[PDB]
Design a binder for this molecule. Structure first.
Ligand SMILES: [Zn+2]
Ligand SMILES: [Zn+2]
Ligand SMILES: [Zn+2]
Ligand SMILES: [Zn+2]
Lengths: 84, 76
DNA sequence: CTAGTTCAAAGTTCACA
DNA sequence: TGTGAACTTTGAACTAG
């Protein structure tokens, strides 16, 4: 055999996870995206058909689909706090 | 028991006052590092569970007004 | 006597076509 | 523009005895 060092991946985009953010294992990108969205109650529109692939290379291509994938994966809006 | 500073659930007496783990930690740190804050608004920010972290000056002042004593916190 | 600590998960910044 | 890597506080859980 061989020794295993624990790696977590983003449940939104499959990128390497910096830990759990807002209730789910996510990267710094998806954490920041979700924060900014929730902070100003931003709403987006999918230019395609609400089924855009959300991965490291595609995540920035559709804010709508990225946001719905955050919620579908269990990211909690109530875990986003007020400004400091 | 409720936290006399923010109204959250109190974990018991801390530095003379019934407070939450948040106000304990925040008061401990403020004293240790001898921190000075400045209010962003008008020295009368509402301090409660959801708003406690919005202004450190008004929280520290509510910590003193509710009776927290600096001399209770360990120095170095 | 009536205190102490840790560190994940909250926060915020700022370089870049 | 809006992103995300790299940073600063916070507070739930727990410590010694
Ligand atoms: Zn991600
Ligand atoms: Zn889409
Ligand atoms: Zn409190
Ligand atoms: Zn204030």
């Amino acid at each position: 055999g061989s020794h295993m060092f624990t790696k977590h991946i983003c449940a939104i985009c499959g990128d390497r996870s910096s830990g759990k953010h807002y209730g789910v294992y996510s990267c710094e990108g998806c954490k920041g995206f979700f924060k900014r969205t929730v902070r100003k109650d931003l709403t987006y529109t999918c230019r395609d058909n609400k089924d855009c692939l959300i991965d490291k290379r595609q995540r920035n291509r559709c804010q709508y689909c990225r946001y719905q994938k955050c919620l579908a994966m269990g990211m909690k809006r109530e875990a986003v706090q007020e400004e400091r």
